Amino acid sequence: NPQQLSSNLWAAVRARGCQFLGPAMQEEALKLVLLALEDGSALSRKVLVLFVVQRLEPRFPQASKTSIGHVVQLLYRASCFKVTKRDEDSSLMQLKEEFRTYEALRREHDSQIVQIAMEAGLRIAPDQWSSLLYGDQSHKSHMQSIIDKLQT
RNA sequence: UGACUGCGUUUUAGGAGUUA
């Protein structure tokens, strides 16, 4: 259904403890993660979330620790981090080296959402995908490529 | 039902609390 495949996607996403804040805001949030993690710094999730929230909140009041926490889980599910567990304390996390460019990181992010849609049996075309995730028709073939790699 | 806050999930995952 024309905007109800859309709300069922975000339902499936929220159910997996993840979240999409819209094309513009998601983009900044990811860039911020990269800013913190691309030089190989190692931050607990708590601190990483703080880093992003503190810069984003003043420009987007929808940006809570809770909501940004959910964006980061998207990347946790996508297996983007190198995790270092510590005894009696929280894990630190770094970006895997292959994911230290926006292009690369965003591919994985995107893929993870597609995969959630697949797990939930939601057939969605690349034209749609480019609208949902970018608000334009400029990423159809990017999204097509993601889809094809996922069914193999 | 939402929102929020912890802790957990790389052995892949949530779940508790607070609140209207």
Author numbering: 175 to 326
What do the authors say?
The Roquin protein is essential in T cells for the prevention of autoimmune disease. We have recently reported structural and functional data of the Roquin-1 ROQ domain bound to a canonical constitutive decay element (CDE), a short stem loop (SL) that acts as a cis-regulatory RNA element in the 3′-untranslated regions (3′-UTRs) of target genes such as Tnf. The ROQ domain adopts an extended winged helix fold that engages predominantly non-sequence-specific protein–RNA contacts and mainly recognizes the shape of the canonical Tnf CDE RNA. Here we present structural and functional evidence for a greatly expanded repertoire of RNA elements that are regulated by Roquin as demonstrated with a novel U-rich hexaloop SL in the 3′-UTR of Ox40 bound to the Roquin-1 ROQ domain.
We set out to identify Roquin-bound RNA motifs in an unbiased manner by performing SELEX experiments. Evaluation of the structural context for the SELEX-derived motif suggested a putative SL formation with six unpaired nucleotides in a loop followed by a 5–8 nt stem, with one base in the stem not being paired. The structures of ROQ bound to the 20-mer ADE SL and to the 22-mer Ox40 ADE-like SL RNAs were refined to a resolution of 3.0 and 2.2 Å, respectively. In both structures the RNA adopts an SL fold, where the hexaloop is located in the vicinity of the carboxy-terminal end of ROQ helix α4 and the N-terminal part of β3. Interestingly, although the sequences of the ADE SL and ADE-like SL RNAs are different, the overall structures and protein–RNA contacts are virtually identical. The only differences are a C19 bulge, the non-Watson–Crick G6–G15 base pair and the interaction of U1 with Trp184 and Phe194 in the ADE-like SL RNA. Notably, we also found an unambiguous imino proton signal for G15, but not G6, in the ADE SL, indicating a non-Watson–Crick G–G base pair at this position. On the other hand, comparison of ROQ domain binding with the ADE and with the ADE-like SL RNAs indicates almost identical NMR spectra and CSPs. In summary, similar to the CDE SL, both the ADE SL and ADE-like SL RNAs are recognized mainly by non-sequence-specific contacts. In this respect, it is interesting to note that symmetry-related RNA molecules of both Tnf CDE and ADE SL RNAs are found in the respective crystal lattice in a position that corresponds to the recognition of dsRNA in the B site111222.
